[PDB]
PDB file of C-alpha atoms and ligand atoms in Angstrom:
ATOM      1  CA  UNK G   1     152.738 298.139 -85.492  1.00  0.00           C
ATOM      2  CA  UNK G   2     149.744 296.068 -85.194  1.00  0.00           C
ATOM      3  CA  UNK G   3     148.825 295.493 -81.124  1.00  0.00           C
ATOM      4  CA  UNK G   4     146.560 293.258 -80.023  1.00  0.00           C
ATOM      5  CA  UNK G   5     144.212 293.621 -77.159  1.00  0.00           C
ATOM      6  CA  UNK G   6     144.274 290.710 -74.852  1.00  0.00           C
ATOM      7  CA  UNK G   7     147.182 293.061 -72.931  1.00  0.00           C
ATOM      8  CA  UNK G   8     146.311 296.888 -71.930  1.00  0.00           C
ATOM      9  CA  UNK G   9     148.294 298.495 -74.757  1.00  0.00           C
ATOM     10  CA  UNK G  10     149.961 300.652 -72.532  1.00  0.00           C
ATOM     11  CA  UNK G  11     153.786 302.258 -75.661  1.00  0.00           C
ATOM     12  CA  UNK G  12     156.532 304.280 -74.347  1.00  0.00           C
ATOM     13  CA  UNK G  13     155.990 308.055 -74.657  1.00  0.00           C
ATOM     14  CA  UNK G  14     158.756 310.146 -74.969  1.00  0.00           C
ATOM     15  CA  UNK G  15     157.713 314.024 -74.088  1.00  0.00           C
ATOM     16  CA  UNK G  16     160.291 316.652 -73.197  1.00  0.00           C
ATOM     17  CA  UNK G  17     162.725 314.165 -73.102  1.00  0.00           C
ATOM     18  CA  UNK G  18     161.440 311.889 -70.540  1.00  0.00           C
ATOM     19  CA  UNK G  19     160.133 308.461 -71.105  1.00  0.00           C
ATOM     20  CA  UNK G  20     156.907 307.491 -69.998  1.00  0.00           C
ATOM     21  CA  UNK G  21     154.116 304.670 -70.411  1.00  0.00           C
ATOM     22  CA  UNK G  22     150.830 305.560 -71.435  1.00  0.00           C
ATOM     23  CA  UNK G  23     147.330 303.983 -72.625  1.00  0.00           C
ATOM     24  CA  UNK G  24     146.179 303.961 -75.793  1.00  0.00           C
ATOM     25  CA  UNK G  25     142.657 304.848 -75.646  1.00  0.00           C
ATOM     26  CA  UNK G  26     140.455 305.054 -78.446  1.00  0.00           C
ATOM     27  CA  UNK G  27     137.368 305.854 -75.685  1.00  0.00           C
ATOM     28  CA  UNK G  28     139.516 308.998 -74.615  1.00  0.00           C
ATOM     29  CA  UNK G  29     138.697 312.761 -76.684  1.00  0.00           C
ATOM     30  CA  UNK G  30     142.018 313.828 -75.020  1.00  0.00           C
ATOM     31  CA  UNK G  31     145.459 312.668 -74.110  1.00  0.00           C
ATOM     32  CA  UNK G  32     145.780 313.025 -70.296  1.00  0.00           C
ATOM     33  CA  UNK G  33     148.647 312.342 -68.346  1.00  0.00           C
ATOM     34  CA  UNK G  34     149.508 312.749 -64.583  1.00  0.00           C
ATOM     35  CA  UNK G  35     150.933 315.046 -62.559  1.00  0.00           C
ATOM     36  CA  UNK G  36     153.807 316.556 -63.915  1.00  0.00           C
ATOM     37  CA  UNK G  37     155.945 319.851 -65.048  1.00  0.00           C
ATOM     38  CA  UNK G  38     155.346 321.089 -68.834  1.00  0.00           C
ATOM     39  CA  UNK G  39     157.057 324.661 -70.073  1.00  0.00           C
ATOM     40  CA  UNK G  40     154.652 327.404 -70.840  1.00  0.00           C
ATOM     41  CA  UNK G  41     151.149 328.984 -70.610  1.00  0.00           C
ATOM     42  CA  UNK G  42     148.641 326.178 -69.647  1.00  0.00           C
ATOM     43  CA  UNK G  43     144.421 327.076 -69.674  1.00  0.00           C
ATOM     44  CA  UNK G  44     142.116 325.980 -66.782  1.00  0.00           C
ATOM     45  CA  UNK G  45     140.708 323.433 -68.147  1.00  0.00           C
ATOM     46  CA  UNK G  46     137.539 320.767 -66.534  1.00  0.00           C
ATOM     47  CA  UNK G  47     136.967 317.208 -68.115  1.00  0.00           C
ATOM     48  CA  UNK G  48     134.605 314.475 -67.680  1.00  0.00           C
ATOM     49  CA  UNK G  49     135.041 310.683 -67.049  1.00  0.00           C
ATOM     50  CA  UNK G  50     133.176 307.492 -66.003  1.00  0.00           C
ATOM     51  CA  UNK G  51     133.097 309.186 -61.600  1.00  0.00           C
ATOM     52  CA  UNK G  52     132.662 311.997 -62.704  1.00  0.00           C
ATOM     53  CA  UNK G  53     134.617 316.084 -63.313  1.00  0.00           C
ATOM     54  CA  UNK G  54     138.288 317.205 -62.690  1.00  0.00           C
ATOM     55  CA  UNK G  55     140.325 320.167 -63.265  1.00  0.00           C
ATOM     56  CA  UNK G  56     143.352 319.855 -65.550  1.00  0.00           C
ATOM     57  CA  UNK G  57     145.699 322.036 -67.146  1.00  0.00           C
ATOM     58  CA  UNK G  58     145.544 322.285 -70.441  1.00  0.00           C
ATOM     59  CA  UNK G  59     149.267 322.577 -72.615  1.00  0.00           C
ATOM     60  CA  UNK G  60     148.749 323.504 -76.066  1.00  0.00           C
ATOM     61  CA  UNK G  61     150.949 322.351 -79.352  1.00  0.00           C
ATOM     62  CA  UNK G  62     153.130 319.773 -77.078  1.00  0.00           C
ATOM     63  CA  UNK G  63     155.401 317.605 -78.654  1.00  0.00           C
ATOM     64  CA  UNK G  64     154.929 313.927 -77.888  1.00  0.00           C
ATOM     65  CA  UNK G  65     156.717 310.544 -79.835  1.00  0.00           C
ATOM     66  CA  UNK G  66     154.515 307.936 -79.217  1.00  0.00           C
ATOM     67  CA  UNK G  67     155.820 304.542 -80.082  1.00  0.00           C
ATOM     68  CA  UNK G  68     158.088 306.276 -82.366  1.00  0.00           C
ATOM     69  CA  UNK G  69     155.846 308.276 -84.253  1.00  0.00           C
ATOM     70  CA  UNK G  70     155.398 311.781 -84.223  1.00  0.00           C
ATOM     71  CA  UNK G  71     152.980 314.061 -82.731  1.00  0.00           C
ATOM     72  CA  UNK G  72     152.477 317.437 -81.545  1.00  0.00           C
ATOM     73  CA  UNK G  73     149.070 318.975 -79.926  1.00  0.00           C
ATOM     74  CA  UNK G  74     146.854 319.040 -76.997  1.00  0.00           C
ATOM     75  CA  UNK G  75     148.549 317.414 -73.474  1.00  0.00           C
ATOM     76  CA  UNK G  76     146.369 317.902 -70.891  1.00  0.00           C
ATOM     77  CA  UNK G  77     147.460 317.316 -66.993  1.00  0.00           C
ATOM     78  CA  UNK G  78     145.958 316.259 -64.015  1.00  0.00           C
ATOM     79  CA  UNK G  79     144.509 313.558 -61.713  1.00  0.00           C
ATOM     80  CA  UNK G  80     143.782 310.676 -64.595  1.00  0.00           C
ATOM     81  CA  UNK G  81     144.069 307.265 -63.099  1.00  0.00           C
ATOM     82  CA  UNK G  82     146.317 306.613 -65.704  1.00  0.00           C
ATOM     83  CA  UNK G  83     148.793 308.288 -68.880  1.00  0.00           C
ATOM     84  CA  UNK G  84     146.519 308.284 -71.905  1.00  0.00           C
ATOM     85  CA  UNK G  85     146.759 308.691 -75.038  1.00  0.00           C
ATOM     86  CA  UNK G  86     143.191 310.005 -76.746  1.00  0.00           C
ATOM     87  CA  UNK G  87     141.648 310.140 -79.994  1.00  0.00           C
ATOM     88  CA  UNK G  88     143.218 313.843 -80.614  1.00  0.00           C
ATOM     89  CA  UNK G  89     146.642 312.262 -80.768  1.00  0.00           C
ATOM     90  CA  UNK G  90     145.668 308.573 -82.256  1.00  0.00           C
ATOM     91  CA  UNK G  91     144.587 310.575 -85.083  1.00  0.00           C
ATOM     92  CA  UNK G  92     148.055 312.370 -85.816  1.00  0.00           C
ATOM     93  CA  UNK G  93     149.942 309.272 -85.096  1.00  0.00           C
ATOM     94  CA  UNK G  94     147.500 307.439 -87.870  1.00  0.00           C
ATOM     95  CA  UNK G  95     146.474 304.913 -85.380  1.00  0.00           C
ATOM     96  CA  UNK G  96     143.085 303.052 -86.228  1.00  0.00           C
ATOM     97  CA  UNK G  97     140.521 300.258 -84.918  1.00  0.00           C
ATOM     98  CA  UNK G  98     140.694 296.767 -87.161  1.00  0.00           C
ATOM     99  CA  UNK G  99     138.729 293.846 -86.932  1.00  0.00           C
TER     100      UNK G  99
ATOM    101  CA  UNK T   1     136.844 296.887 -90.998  1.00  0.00           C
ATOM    102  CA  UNK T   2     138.848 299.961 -90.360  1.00  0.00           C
ATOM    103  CA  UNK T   3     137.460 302.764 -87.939  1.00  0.00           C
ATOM    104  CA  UNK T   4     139.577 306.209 -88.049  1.00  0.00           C
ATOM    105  CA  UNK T   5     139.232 307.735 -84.874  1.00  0.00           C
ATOM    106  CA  UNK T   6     138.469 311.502 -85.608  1.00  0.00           C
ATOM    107  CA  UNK T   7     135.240 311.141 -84.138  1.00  0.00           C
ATOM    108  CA  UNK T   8     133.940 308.547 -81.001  1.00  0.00           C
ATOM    109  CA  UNK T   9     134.311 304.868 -82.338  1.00  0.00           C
ATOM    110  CA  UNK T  10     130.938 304.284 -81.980  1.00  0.00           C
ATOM    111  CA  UNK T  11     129.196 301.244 -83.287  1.00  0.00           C
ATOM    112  CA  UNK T  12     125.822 299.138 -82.875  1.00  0.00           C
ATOM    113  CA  UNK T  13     125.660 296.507 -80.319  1.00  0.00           C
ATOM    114  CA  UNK T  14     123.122 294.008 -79.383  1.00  0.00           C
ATOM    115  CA  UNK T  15     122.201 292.688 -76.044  1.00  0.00           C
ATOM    116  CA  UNK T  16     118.782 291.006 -76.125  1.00  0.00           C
ATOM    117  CA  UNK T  17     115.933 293.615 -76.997  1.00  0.00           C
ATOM    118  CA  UNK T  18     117.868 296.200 -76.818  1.00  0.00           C
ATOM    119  CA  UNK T  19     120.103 297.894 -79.678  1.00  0.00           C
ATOM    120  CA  UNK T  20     122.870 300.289 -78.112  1.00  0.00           C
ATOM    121  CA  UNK T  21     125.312 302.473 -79.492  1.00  0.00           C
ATOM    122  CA  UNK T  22     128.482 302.083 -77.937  1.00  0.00           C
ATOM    123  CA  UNK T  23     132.199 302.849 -78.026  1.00  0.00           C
ATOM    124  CA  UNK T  24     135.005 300.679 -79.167  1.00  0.00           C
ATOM    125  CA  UNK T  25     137.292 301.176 -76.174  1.00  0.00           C
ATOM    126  CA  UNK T  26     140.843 299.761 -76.049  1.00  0.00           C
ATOM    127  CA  UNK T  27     141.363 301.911 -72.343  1.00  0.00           C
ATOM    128  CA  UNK T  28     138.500 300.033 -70.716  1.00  0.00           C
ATOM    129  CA  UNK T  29     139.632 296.708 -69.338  1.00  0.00           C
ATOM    130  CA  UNK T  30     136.251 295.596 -68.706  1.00  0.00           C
ATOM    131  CA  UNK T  31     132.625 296.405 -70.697  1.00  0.00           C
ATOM    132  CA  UNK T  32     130.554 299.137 -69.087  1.00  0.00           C
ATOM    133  CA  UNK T  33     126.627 299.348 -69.754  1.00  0.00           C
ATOM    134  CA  UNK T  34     124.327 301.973 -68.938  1.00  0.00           C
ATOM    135  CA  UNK T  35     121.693 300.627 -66.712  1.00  0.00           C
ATOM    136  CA  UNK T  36     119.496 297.770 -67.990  1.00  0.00           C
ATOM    137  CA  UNK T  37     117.408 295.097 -65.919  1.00  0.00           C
ATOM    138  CA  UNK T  38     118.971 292.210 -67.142  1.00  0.00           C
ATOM    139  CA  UNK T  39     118.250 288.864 -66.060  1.00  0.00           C
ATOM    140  CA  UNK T  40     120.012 286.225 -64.022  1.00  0.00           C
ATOM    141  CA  UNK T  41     122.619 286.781 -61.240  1.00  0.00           C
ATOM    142  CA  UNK T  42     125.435 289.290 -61.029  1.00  0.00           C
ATOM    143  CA  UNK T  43     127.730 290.712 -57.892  1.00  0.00           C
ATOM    144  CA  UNK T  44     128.727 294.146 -57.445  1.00  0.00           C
ATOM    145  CA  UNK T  45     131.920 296.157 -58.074  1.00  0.00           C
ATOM    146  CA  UNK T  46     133.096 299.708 -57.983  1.00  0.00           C
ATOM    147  CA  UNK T  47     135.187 300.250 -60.913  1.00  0.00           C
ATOM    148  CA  UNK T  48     137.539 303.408 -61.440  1.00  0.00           C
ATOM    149  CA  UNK T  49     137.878 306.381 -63.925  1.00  0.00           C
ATOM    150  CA  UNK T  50     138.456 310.112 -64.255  1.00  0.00           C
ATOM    151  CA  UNK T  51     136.904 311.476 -61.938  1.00  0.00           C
ATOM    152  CA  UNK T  52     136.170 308.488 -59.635  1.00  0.00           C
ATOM    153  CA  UNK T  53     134.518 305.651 -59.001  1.00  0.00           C
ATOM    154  CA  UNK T  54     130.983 304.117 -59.861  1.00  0.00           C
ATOM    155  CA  UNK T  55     128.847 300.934 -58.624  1.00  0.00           C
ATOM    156  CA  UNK T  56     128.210 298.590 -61.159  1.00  0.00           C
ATOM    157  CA  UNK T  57     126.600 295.211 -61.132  1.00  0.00           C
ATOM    158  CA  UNK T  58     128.789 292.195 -63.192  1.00  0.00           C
ATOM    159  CA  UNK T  59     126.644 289.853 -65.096  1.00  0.00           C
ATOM    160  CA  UNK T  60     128.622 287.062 -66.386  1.00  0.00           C
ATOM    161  CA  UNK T  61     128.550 285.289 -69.777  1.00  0.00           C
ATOM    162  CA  UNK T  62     126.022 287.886 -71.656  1.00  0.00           C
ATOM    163  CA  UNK T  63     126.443 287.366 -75.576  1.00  0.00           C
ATOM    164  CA  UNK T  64     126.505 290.854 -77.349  1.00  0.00           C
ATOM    165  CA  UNK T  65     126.391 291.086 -80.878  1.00  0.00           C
ATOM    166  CA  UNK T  66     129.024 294.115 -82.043  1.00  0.00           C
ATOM    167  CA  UNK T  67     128.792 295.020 -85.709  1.00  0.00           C
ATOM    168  CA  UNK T  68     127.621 291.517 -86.471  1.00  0.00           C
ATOM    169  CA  UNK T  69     130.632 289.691 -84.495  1.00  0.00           C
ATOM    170  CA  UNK T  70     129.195 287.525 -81.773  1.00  0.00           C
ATOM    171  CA  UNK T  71     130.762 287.466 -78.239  1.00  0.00           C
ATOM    172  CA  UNK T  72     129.781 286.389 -74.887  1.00  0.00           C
ATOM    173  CA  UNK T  73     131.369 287.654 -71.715  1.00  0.00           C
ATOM    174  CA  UNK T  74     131.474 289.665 -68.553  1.00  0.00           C
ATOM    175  CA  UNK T  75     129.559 292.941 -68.897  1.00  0.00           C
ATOM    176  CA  UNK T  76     129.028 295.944 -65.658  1.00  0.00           C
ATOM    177  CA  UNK T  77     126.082 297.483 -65.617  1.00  0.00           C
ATOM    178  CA  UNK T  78     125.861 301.310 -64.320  1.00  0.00           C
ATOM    179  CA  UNK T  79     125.693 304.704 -64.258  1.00  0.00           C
ATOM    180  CA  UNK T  80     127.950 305.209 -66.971  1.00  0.00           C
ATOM    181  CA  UNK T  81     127.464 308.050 -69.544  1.00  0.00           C
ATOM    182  CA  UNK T  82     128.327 305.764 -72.655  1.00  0.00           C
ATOM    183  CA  UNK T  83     128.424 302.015 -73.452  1.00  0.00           C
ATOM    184  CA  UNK T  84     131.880 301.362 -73.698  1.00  0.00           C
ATOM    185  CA  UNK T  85     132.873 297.967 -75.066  1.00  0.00           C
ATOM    186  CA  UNK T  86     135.909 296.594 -73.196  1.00  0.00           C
ATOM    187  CA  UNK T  87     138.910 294.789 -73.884  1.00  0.00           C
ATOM    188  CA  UNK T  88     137.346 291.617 -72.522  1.00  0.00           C
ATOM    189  CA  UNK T  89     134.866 291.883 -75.893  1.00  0.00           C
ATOM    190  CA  UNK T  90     136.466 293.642 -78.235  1.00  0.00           C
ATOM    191  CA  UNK T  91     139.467 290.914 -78.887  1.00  0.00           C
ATOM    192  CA  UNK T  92     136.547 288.338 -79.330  1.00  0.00           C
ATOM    193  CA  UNK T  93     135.858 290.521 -82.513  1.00  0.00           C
ATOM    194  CA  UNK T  94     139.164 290.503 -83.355  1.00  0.00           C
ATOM    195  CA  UNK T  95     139.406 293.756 -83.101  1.00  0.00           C
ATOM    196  CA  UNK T  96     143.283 295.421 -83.209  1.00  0.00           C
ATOM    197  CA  UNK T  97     145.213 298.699 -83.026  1.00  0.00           C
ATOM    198  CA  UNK T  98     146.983 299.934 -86.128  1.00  0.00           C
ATOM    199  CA  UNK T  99     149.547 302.343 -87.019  1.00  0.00           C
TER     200      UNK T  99
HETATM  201  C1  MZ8 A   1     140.401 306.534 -68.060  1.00  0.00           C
HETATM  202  C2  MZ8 A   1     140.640 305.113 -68.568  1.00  0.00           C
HETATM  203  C3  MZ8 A   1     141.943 304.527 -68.034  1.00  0.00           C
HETATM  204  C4  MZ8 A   1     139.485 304.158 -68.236  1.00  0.00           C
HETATM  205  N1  MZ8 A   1     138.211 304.653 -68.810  1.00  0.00           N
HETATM  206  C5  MZ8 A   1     138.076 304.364 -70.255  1.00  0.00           C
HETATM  207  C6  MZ8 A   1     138.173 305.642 -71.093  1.00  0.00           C
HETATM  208  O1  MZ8 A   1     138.293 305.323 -72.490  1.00  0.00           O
HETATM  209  C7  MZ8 A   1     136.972 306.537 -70.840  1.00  0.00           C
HETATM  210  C8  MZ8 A   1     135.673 306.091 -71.534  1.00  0.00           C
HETATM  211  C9  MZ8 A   1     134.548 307.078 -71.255  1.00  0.00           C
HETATM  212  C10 MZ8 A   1     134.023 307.230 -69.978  1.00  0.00           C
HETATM  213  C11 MZ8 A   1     133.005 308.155 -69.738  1.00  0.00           C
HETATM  214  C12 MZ8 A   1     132.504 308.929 -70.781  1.00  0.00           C
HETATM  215  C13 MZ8 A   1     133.029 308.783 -72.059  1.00  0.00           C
HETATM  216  C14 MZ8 A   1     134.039 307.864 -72.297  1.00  0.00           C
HETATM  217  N2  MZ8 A   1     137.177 307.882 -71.359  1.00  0.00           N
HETATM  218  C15 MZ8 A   1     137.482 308.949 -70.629  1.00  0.00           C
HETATM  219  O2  MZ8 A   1     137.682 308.955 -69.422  1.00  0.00           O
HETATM  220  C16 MZ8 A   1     137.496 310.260 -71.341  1.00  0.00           C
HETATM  221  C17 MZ8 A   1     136.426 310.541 -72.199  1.00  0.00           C
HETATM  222  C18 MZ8 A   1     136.344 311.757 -72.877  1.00  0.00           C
HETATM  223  C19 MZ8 A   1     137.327 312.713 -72.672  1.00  0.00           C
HETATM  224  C20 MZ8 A   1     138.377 312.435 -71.796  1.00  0.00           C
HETATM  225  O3  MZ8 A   1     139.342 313.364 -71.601  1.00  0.00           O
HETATM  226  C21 MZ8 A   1     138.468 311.218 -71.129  1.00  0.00           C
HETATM  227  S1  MZ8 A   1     136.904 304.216 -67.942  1.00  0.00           S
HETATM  228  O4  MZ8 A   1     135.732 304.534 -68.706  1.00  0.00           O
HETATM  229  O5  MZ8 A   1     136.951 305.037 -66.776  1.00  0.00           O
HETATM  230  C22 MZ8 A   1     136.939 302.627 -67.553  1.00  0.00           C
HETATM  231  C23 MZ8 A   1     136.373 301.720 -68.460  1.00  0.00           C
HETATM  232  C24 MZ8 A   1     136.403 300.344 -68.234  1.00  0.00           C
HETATM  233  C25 MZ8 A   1     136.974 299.820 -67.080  1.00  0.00           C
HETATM  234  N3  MZ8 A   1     137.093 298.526 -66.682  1.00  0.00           N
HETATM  235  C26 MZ8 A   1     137.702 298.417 -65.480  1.00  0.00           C
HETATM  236  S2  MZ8 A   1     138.203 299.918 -64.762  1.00  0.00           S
HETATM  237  C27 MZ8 A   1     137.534 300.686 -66.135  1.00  0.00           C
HETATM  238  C28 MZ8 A   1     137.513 302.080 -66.385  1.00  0.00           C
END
């Protein structure tokens, strides 16, 4: 689809069978989502934003359909303000900026 | 046109004297400057991130040229690490999501 930007453009994710609403955010490296349980081996993991450095855990080769499109690769986890969807996954998903 | 998003959407802006790179940000509600003595009146706000918050001043109706696309608008100024270009700008552009 084509979204506009006058609303956040916050899609449904669907990851290990849950659904969940997330941000897509072309300003984020990484897809970051909040607390939650993922299956196996996470890394350590520290990340910066606008206030500053927190610790995440870092899930490798995740599956995630975003808006109905397929991805699979980096999830991390932690204390983001809010479920986002970064540039690692944009990419996979083919999303791009137009103007 | 059409930015891909394997690497930071990073463009040219304009604000007065001073060129800036800064990123095309559809997860930023609002336009975030790093610091810059601009003129006129503003009020302050603490706006929130990974990691935290920060104090930022909001200067109201600054026109920003962004890739040659004029807008005028709300802009914080701070002690952010990049110029992100918010969602109050960026549909002045015209700017969309694609995929
Ligand atoms: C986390 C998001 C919900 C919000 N952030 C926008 C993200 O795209 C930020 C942009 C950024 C900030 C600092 C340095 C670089 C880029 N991106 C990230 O937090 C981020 C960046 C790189 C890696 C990563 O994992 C996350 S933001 O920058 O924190 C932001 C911006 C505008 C704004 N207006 C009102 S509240 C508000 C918050």
């Amino acid at each position: 689809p084509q979204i506009t930007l006058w609303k956040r453009p916050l899609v449904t994710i669907r990851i290990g069978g849950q659904l969940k609403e997330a941000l897509l955010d072309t300003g984020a490296d990484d897809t970051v989502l909040e607390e939650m349980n993922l299956p196996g081996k996470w890394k350590p993991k520290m990340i910066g934003g606008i206030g500053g450095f927190i610790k995440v855990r870092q899930y490798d080769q995740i599956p995630i359909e975003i808006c109905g499109h397929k991805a699979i690769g980096t999830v991390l986890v932690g204390p983001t303000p809010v479920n986002i969807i970064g540039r690692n996954l944009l990419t996979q998903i083919g999303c791009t900026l137009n103007f």
